[PDB]
Amino acid sequence: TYSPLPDDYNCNVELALTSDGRTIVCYHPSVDIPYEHTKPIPRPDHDQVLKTRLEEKVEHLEEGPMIEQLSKMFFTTKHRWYPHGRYHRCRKNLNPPKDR
Amino acid sequence: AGGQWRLQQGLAANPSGYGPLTELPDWSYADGRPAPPMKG
Amino acid sequence: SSFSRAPQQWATFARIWYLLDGKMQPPGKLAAMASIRLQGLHKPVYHALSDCGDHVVIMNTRHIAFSGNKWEQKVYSSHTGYPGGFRQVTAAQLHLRDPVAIVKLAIYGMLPKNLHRRTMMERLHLFPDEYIPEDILKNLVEELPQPRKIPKRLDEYTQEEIDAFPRLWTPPEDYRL
Amino acid sequence: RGRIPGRQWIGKHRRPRFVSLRAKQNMIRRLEIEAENHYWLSM
Amino acid sequence: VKCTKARYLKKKNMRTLWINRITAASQEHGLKYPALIGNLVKCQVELNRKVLADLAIYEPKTFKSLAALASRRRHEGFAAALGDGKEPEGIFSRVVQYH
Amino acid sequence: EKDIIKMLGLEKAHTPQVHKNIPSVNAKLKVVKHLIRIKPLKLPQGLPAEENMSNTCLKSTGELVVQWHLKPVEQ
Amino acid sequence: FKNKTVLKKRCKDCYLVKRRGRWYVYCKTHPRHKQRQM
Amino acid sequence: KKLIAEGPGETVLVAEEEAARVALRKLYGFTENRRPWNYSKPK
Amino acid sequence: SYLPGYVPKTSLSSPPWPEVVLPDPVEETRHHAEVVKKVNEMIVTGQYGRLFAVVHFASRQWKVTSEDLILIGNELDLACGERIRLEKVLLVGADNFTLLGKPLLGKDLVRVEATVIEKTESWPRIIMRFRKRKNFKKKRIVTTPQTVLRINSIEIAPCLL
Amino acid sequence: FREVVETQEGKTTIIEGRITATPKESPNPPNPSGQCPICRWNLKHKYNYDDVLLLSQFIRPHGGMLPRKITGLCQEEHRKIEECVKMAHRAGLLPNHRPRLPEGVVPKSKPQLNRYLTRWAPGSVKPIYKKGPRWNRVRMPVGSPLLRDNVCYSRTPWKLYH
Ligand code: FES
Ligand SMILES: [K+]
Ligand SMILES: [Mg+2]
Ligand SMILES: [Zn+2]
Numbered sequence: 001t002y003s004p005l006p007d008d009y010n011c012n013v014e015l016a017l018t019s020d021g022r023t024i025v026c027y028h029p030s031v032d033i034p035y036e037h038t039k040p041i042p043r044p045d046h047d048q049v050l051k052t053r054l055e056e057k058v059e060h061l062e063e064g065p066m067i068e069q070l071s072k073m074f075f076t077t078k079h080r081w082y083p084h085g086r087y088h089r090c091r092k093n094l095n096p097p098k099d100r
Numbered sequence: 101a102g103g104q105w106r107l108q109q110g111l112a113a114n115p116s117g118y119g120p121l122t123e124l125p126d127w128s129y130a131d132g133r134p135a136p137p138m139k140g
Numbered sequence: 141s142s143f144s145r146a147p148q149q150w151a152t153f154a155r156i157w158y159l160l161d162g163k164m165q166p167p168g169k170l171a172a173m174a175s176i177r178l179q180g181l182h183k184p185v186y187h188a189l190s191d192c193g194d195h196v197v198i199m200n201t202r203h204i205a206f207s208g209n210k211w212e213q214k215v216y217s218s219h220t221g222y223p224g225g226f227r228q229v230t231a232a233q234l235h236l237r238d239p240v241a242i243v244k245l246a247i248y249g250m251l252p253k254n255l256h257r258r259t260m261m262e263r264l265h266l267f268p269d270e271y272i273p274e275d276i277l278k279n280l281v282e283e284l285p286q287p288r289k290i291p292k293r294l295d296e297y298t299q300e301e302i303d304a305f306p307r308l309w310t311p312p313e314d315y316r317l
Numbered sequence: 318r319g320r321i322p323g324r325q326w327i328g329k330h331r332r333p334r335f336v337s338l339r340a341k342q343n344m345i346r347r348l349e350i351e352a353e354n355h356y357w358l359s360m
Numbered sequence: 361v362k363c364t365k366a367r368y369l370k371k372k373n374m375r376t377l378w379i380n381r382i383t384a385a386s387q388e389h390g391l392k393y394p395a396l397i398g399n400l401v402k403c404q405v406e407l408n409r410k411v412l413a414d415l416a417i418y419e420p421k422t423f424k425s426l427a428a429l430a431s432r433r434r435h436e437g438f439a440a441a442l443g444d445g446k447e448p449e450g451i452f453s454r455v456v457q458y459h
Numbered sequence: 460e461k462d463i464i465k466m467l468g469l470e471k472a473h474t475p476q477v478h479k480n481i482p483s484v485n486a487k488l489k490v491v492k493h494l495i496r497i498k499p500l501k502l503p504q505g506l507p508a509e510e511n512m513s514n515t516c517l518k519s520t521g522e523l524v525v526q527w528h529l530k531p532v533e534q
Numbered sequence: 535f536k537n538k539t540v541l542k543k544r545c546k547d548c549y550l551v552k553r554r555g556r557w558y559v560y561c562k563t564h565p566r567h568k569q570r571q572m
Numbered sequence: 573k574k575l576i577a578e579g580p581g582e583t584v585l586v587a588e589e590e591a592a593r594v595a596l597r598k599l600y601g602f603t604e605n606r607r608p609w610n611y612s613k614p615k
Numbered sequence: 616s617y618l619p620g621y622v623p624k625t626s627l628s629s630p631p632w633p634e635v636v637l638p639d640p641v642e643e644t645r646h647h648a649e650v651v652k653k654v655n656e657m658i659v660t661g662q663y664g665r666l667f668a669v670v671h672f673a674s675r676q677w678k679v680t681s682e683d684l685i686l687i688g689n690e691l692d693l694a695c696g697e698r699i700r701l702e703k704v705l706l707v708g709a710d711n712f713t714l715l716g717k718p719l720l721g722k723d724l725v726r727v728e729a730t731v732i733e734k735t736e737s738w739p740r741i742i743m744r745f746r747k748r749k750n751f752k753k754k755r756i757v758t759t760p761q762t763v764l765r766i767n768s769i770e771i772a773p774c775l776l
Numbered sequence: 777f778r779e780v781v782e783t784q785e786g787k788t789t790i791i792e793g794r795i796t797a798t799p800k801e802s803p804n805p806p807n808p809s810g811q812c813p814i815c816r817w818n819l820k821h822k823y824n825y826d827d828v829l830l831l832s833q834f835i836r837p838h839g840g841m842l843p844r845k846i847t848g849l850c851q852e853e854h855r856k857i858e859e860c861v862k863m864a865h866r867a868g869l870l871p872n873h874r875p876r877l878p879e880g881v882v883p884k885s886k887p888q889l890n891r892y893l894t895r896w897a898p899g900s901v902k903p904i905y906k907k908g909p910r911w912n913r914v915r916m917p918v919g920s921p922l923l924r925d926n927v928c929y930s931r932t933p934w935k936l937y938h
Contacts, residue, residue, distance in 0.1 A: 015432065025714055025775065041584055075195070075259075101394075111519065115718075184384050205892055207919075208895060212898055215904055293868065306801075310801045313778070315777050354495065360480070405718065415678070422706075608680075617802070621817075623819060626823065628822050
């Protein structure tokens with residue numbers, strides 16, 4: 001009943017040695033998430049004479065409030081949202097290499 | 101790491117020293133012809 | 141895992157929310173765990189030139205425990221910059237003035253001394269008295285175990301354990317204990 | 318506020334230095350090696 | 361001059377990054393970097409830290425198997441140390457002798 | 460001490476060198492005994508003959524084996 | 535009180551007690567015998 | 573009540589679409605860890 | 616009720632780690648035999664996909680698979696297009712099973728083949744040494760040879776047990 | 777044990793003593809040859825401040841300490857148990873054992889500060905305003921130096937000064 005590691009999160013690890021002792025065999029089939037350990041998808045979320053006329057109504061906040069909103073939204077600081085200069089903009093490479 | 105254990109077991113402290121991992125040929129031809137010996 | 145490139149990258153570089161209970165726990169150990177989680181040193185894909193940090197929410201910061209006499213010996217010092225503006229306070233005074241200051245200062249001291257430390261502090265969350273906002277409670281993922289095991293008081297021990305622990309000496313029958 | 322007069326490691330007053338456990342272990346190891354050298358030179 | 365001298369620091373930085381990633385994986389699996397490296401060496405598994413980090417990033421199940429092997433070797437070593445030495449060597453404690 | 464090391468030939472560290480267990484060599488070694496490690500040369504299989512002068516290996520245990528197959532023992 | 539390094543009892547009435555982390559030689563018959571550890 | 577595929581994403585709909593794509597790949601045999609194409613000469 | 620050597624349960628009476636009871640050697644040997652048999656049956660039936668191998672080459676370890684490219688900073692004295700076999704394999708792995716060598720796997724067990732596809736020289740490397748206030752300044756430019764190998768097939772054979 | 781009762785009956789105070797049931801040592805000690813209960817039960821170097829089940833057997837109901845002669849312990853174990861009991865009291869591990877308060881005296885509200893391994897009294901030490909240099913650092917004492925000989929399973933020895 002001895003197990004070096006628990007077998008309930010990633011895979012069932014079984015270790016063995018060949019007869020000559022020169023080869024170590026590792027058998028690790030992955031575990032599957034049980035049905036009981038899952039949540040259902042939250043799919044669920046008038047006499048209107050006029051149509052549902054919805055328009056984008058968001059005024060542009062100033063630099064300060066906008067940067068504060070972005071920092072609070074993304075859990076960051078204001079310096080990242082503050083702009084940069086033409087020197088760095090032109091130094092940045094527009095065609096970076098791609099591995100895969 | 102493990103140099104003392106290797107010395108106790110009778111092997112070189114550095115795994116890159118004498119042994120099959122270092123002195124065996126690195127490669128050989130697919131047709132089976134042995135490769136020329138390494139300069140080291 | 142046969143994932144597409146964008147879902148795979150989004151899954152790999154994702155932020156996880158950890159919860160840490162500070163109920164009678166060493167502030168230094170709490171700060172070490174929080175610093176590890178904030179730096180992302182717990183991830184095999186960690187690198188400095190990336191954002192591998194995870195959100196940490198520490199509760200019960202008011203109920204931290206200091207070993208020894210640190211509440212009276214440990215001193216936090218600061219300077220307002222003006223002449224005669226050098227202020228030193230004890231750990232107890234700082235805790236009374238701000239119940240989330242000691243853990244915050246410990247985490248700030250343990251984090252790397254670079255420009256990412258402020259972002260890590262922003263991602264860090266501290267709440268006293270077991271109160272957490274609904275958003276923060278809903279976006280939680282994992283709860284880290286407490287580092288220090290809380291000892292039990294004499295009244296907490298069960299009668300079974302009391303009977304199991306044997307008597308060691310026989311007091312005189314005439315003593316006035 | 319804690320100053321060492323003059324240079325730290327030279328002069329009449331110096332910054333104190335303290336021996337560590339690993340330093341003691343290293344010295345003991347070298348002493349054992351030299352003792353074995355003495356034994357092997359004994360014959 | 362900086363370019364010439366940075367070639368020494370590049371290897372040190374790479375090794376430090378590999379050690380950090382291996383430590384992260386070991387902590388995820390419940391072990392530590394020394395208890396992993398030493399117990400893998402005791403099993404005649406000569407995998408360098410770069411390969412170990414690559415396995416931790418891309419082969420989580422293989423790395424878990426390696427961690428289980430290291431933990432088993434560590435437990436066998438603890439048992440041997442606790443014993444008087446008369447006990448036979450463990451299955452994974454045997455060393456394949458070369459000549 | 461520098462000159463005695465140079466005469467002994469131990470200019471490169473961690474490089475084994477062979478010397479004769481004679482009083483003069485011992486006297487030379489006694490001056491640099493705090494910089495060197497000394498072991499006895501153990502010959503479990505005898506001196507290397509002319510034929511097996513290329514299959515010799517000096518193990519970390521101080522043994523000069525004359526056969527080096529780079530293969531595990533079948534046993 | 536008088537600060538001293540080696541506290542001594544000037545009379546038999548003097549008694550030693552450790553308070554506030556420091557030793558004190560208190561006395562009642564001769565209050566001048568009161569001493570504080572330095 | 574048997575898992576056939578799992579998909580990650582930023583939203584529930586995207587994750588479900590990715591899970592369906594993974595299931596389709598598994599059914600069609602175009603898994604990422606599939607057997608590589610054999611380029612050996614006809615022998 | 617207290618045998619000799621008994622210690623009442625306190626904070627330091629028992630070690631702070633749980634005790635480990637290793638399996639019996641004979642039963643564990645039987646379990647190992649069963650595991651080896653089932654893994655060998657999987658290998659025979661071909662119930663595996665892409666294989667990855669950690670091998671030793673050019674004084675370092677490479678984790679490679681099929682269609683991979685490796686750049687060795689050394690000339691191998693071979694013509695381009697030649698196929699070679701990497702004989703130093705330390706690890707082989709698949710989705711379900713992993714085999715480790717001590718410290719190397721069997722040649723019959725695992726065979727890894729590569730093809731030489733390119734022989735080049737590295738980009739110029741500058742070695743500049745400058746010493747302050749000593750009129751000491753020297754510069755060198757070097758170009759190390761390089762060889763590109765494409766891994767063609769990592770083939771395993773049933774040889775366990 | 778023995779209890780004393782004072783009754784002011786009819787302007788005539790009567791002081792009486794009565795004998796109540798007393799605990800006895802558990803039978804078959806593992807080490808009968810020991811000269812103290814600790815060494816008889818092989819608890820030497822194997823207890824700490826958190827062992828309230830052990831500390832409570834040598835303390836008064838109000839939190840005091842029992843005489844060494846009455847307990848039967850040796851001087852070293854007596855001092856160690858006294859230090860452990862002080863640390864337990866400072867850590868609040870003995871809620872039942874509290875100092876006796878005179879009638880009509882209600883303690884004022886005080887801030888609560890959880891603590892453990894408290895060597896000195898909380899109201900005796902002064903703040904470390906000047907820590908000093910590294911070679912002359914003023915360390916904060918943690919734990920009791922008397923427990924330096926306790927078993928240390930960890931490789932790192934106990935740090936008695938932080
Ligand atoms: S416990 Fe043995 S001498 Fe006191
Ligand atoms: K000086
Ligand atoms: Mg100076
Ligand atoms: Zn007096």
